[PDB]
Every structure is written in structure tokens, then in C-alpha cells.
Amino acid sequence: ELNSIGVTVGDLANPFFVQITKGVELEARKLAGDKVKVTLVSSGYDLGQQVAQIDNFIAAKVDMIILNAADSKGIGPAVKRAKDAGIVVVAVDVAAEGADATITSDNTQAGAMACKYISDRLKEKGNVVIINGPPVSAIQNRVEGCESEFKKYPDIKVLSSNQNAKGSREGGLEVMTSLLAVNPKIDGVFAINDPTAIGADLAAKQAQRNEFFIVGVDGSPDAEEALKRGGNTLFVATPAQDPQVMASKAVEVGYGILQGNPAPKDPILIPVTLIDKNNISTYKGWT
Ligand SMILES: [Cl-]
Ligand SMILES: [Cl-]
Numbered sequence: 001e002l003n004s005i006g007v008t009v010g011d012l013a014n015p016f017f018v019q020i021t022k023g024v025e026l027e028a029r030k031l032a033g034d035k036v037k038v039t040l041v042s043s044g045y046d047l048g049q050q051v052a053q054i055d056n057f058i059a060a061k062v063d064m065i066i067l068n069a070a071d072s073k074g075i076g077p078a079v080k081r082a083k084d085a086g087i088v089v090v091a092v093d094v095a096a097e098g099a100d101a102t103i104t105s106d107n108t109q110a111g112a113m114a115c116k117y118i119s120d121r122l123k124e125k126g127n128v129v130i131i132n133g134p135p136v137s138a139i140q141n142r143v144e145g146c147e148s149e150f151k152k153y154p155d156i157k158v159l160s161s162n163q164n165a166k167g168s169r170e171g172g173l174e175v176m177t178s179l180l181a182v183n184p185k186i187d188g189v190f191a192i193n194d195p196t197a198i199g200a201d202l203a204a205k206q207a208q209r210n211e212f213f214i215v216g217v218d219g220s221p222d223a224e225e226a227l228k229r230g231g232n233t234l235f236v237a238t239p240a241q242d243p244q245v246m247a248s249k250a251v252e253v254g255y256g257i258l259q260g261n262p263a264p265k266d267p268i269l270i271p272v273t274l275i276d277k278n279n280i281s282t283y284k285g286w287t
Contacts, residue, residue: 002032002064002255004039006057008050009068009092012042015221015286016243017068020092023247024066030248031255047071054078057087064088064254066247069096090254092246095137095267100257103250106269107138107217110239111145111190113274114215117237118150118188121213125155126187131175131200133167133192142192142217159183165196172199173206180207189214194222194238201226201235210234219275221287227280239272243286246270 007024009017021040028036039062043050050070057065058081065082067089069075076097082089083098091099118128130146133139143161150156160179165171172191179186180203189212191197197216204210212234216223219240226235249270257263275283 004037004062005064006062007040007066008053019243020247023244027248027251043070047074051078088254090250100263101253102267105241107141108145110272111142112149115146115149124153128188130161131191139192169195169199172196173203176200176203186212194218194220237276240275
């Protein structure tokens with residue numbers, strides 16, 4: 001029943017997506033043995049290219065497509081062509097219009113977890129800032145989860161949460177610099193991803209400010225470098241995504257649907273795991 005799978009992701013070279021492809025291959029092997037054909041392509045973050053890739057998978061008569069959408073809404077017609085051909089389409093990491101199932105990390109948990117960690121470390125009192133990012137679901141969920149957690153602690157004061165650091169080091173540097181200029185005492189920093197947190201770390205370094213610690217999100221190699229660094233950093237923790245499990249779950253769910261199971265009505269969320277000084281030596285990252 002499961003003989004071939006087409007996989008299209010943003011960048012096959014990106015360690016995150018390397019892990020996605022590993023997860024697909026491992027789960028395919030688990031379910032159907034060593035003869036499953038898994039075809040991997042990179043969308044290059046281009047909608048036109050990915051539409052073509054989906055149409056190619058349709059002609060090749062794959063049983064399932066694992067889709068990391070270049071454009072969630074724009075890939076819709078292609079997804080529907082696949083489904084009309086009897087192909088199961090499972091979205092990973094981001095939504096894809098019409099996908100039979102969608103698997104992402106629990107980004108809300110990521111935020112709640114990070115900011116519970118901050119609150120606990122601060123013993124439930126102090127000034128905190130949330131360095132925001134692009135207005136996309138994953139980031140917005142992280143912020144929502146974080147804020148809902150901070151609300152539980154009356155002596156935690158959130159000084160800022162609306163600045164968009166663009167998900168980058170450069171943005172995290174710019175935003176944190178402003179926060180440092182405006183706020184003379186910050187006790188904890190939550191950044192919506194690892195590069196943002198690193199940028200904030202750099203801003204602190206340049207300002208000779210060190211009265212806070214910083215938490216990012218993803219458990220990316222960027223975070224590992226900071227957590228394993230011999231030199232100084234204020235970066236102390238990050239909820240890690242598990243792309244390999246996300247991908248294997250995608251195949252597992254897609255196979256169920258292939259076999260006639262009803263599709264899920266809502267996205268399936270993969271738990272995240274807090275990585276810090278206690279488990280960094282143990283952490284199996286994306287590379
Ligand atoms: Cl990602
Ligand atoms: Cl960056």
C-alpha cells in the first residue's frame with residue numbers, strides 16, 4: 001500500500017529539513033520496509049517551483065506527499081490536485097491549504113515552557129521582556145503561550161512584547177539595544193527564536209549589560225553553540241523542536257489516512273523539550 005513518498009521542503013540542506021527527511025525515511029521503513037521509494041526535493045521557498053513538484057509527484061503516482069509549503073494559501077490548488085488523484089497530503093511545520101493532516105511543533109507550549117522557566121528562575125518576581133518576531137502562526141503562538149504563563153505571576157512585570165526583531169540576529173540586536181536604552185533593569189528575556197536570542201545576547205555584550213538571562217526557541221545548532229560555548233553568554237535555555245519526530249508522525253498519520261482512517265480535524269502538535277545546562281551534553285540536535 002505504501003510504495004512511494006514525495007517530499008518537498010524549503011531547503012534540503014537546512015539541518016532542520018535534513019531531520020525532516022530522516023524522519024520520513026525512518027517511518028516509511030518502519031511501516032513498509034526497505035523498498036519504499038522516498039523522493040526528496042527542495043522548493044527553494046518558491047511557490048511556482050513547489051507547485052511543479054507536486055504535479056510531478058502526482059504524475060509519478062506517489063502514495064503520499066510530505067509538504068513544507070512555500071506559500072500556505074498559494075499551494076492550495078496543487079494540494080487539491082493531489083487529493084483528487086487519491087494522494088494523501090500531510091503538511092509539516094507550517095499549514096498547507098487543504099492538507100489531509102498538518103503536523104507542527106507545539107509552539108504554544110514552546111512559549112509557555114520558556115516563560116515558565118524564566119518565571120521560576122526569577123522566583124516569580126522581576127522585569128521581563130518578550131522580543132517578538134514576524135506575524136506568523138508559530139511565532140504568534142509562542143508569544144501567546146509565553147504571555148499566558150507570565151500572567152500567572154503578579155510580580156513578573158512585562159516591559160515590552162510588541163517589537164518585531166524579524167527572527168534574526170540583526171533584529172534581535174536592534175530591538176534589545178532599544179530595550180536596554182529604555183529599561184535600566186531587565187531580569188529575564190524571552191526571544192521568539194534562537195537567532196533573535198543570540199542577537200539580544202550580542203546587544204547585551206555591546207552594552208556591557210548582564211543582569212538578565214535569555215531564553216530562545218528551537219533547540220537549533222545556533223542554540224547549541226551558545227549553550228556549549230566556553231566564553232560568556234546570557235543565553236541559557238531553548239525549547240527544542242524535534243523535526244525527525246514531526247516527520248515520522250506525518251508519515252504515520254498519512255499512512256493511517258491512506259488505510260481509510262479519518263483525517264484529524266486539527267493540526268497535530270509535537271511536544272518541545274527544554275534544553276539547558278543540565279541536558280545540553282545529552283541533547284541530540286539537528287546536525
Ligand atoms: Cl524552521
Ligand atoms: Cl540571523
